Amino acid sequence: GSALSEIETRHSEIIKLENSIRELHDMFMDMAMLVESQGEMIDRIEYNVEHAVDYVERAVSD
Amino acid sequence: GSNRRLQQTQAQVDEVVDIMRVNVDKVLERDQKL
Amino acid sequence: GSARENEMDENLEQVSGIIGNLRHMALDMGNEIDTQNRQIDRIMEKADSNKTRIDEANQRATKML
Amino acid sequence: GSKLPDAAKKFEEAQEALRQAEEERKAKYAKMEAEREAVRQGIRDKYGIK
Amino acid sequence: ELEEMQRRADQLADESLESTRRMLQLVEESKDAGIRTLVMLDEQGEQLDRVEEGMNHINQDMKEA
């Protein structure tokens, strides 16, 4: 009872807190994982653009 | 007592969790656009 | 045993702190990403417009010769 | 006599090198799209957005 | 009876403590992750602005045609 229970309940409540952190953390990881990957795709649109620029730009000046 | 400080903490998280969910969502819409 | 809990209580403090930080971090990402998502929406409209523009363009250039 | 039906084989081998590059590169992009849409969903469920 | 209650309680408490420890690594990593996440989004912001400028230069030239 009140001696041991006060614990057990504090203990329980902590697991709640951990699992919340767990999720939170998980979300933070995936988040990075995606923005990492997206960064890559993006710098390819940097490649695609930088080119299309050189091309059309150079195909005007007379 | 310090228990109250644990309640608080949890809230503080559950808040952020929700926030982030939404942000992950946003990001999915982003990843899609690429 | 107060020593035990005292370490516990200082761990939670410490945590609670960092969860602070992560809050802000979250909020910031959010608002900022939206911004970018807005930017990407633009770029999609512009590229679609240059599709239509470069296609009708070479049709006149090769229509000349 | 003249000995150049090979240049036909040299350049025809090049041309299938071009067929390989772009028709495969098109197929590889198709599957990566689908399989990262898988990833996109996998996690979407992980957290239950809709 | 009561002897086993206090031993019990001692283990339950430690488990909890170890969790605080565990919570802590989690939160650390989450932050690092947050920061890196942001660095990325920030420089990605630059790039995109450059990409927008690119799409504009096109708007200008094809306007000359």
Mutate to test the interface with A, among B9, B15, B17 (most CBs of A within 10 A): B17
Domains, chain C, ranges and CATH?
Answer: 1-65 (1.20.5.110)
The whole domain housing D49 covers 1-50
Any residues with CB less than 8 A from the CB of E24 and at least 6 apart, and which?
Answer: C11, C14, C15
- DSSP class of residue D5 equals S
Distance of CA A18 to the CA centre of its chain: 20
CA–CA dist C21, B22 (Å, integer): 18
Any residues with CB less than 8 A from the CB of B14 and at least 6 apart, and which?
Answer: A20
Domains, chain E, ranges and CATH?
Answer: 1-65 (1.20.5.110)
CA–CA dist E49, E42 (Å, integer): 11
CATH code, domain carrying D29: 1.20.5.580
The whole domain housing A12 covers 1-62
The closest alpha carbon to C36, from A38, E33, E48, belongs to E48
B23: nearest CB among A10, A13, A31: A31
Any residues with CB less than 8 A from the CB of C43 and at least 6 apart, and which?
Answer: E48, E51, E52, E55
Method used experimentally: X-ray
Domain count across chain A: 1
* Closest residue in chain B to residue C12, using alpha carbons only: B6
Other Cβ atoms less than 10 A from the Cβ of E55: the count is: 18
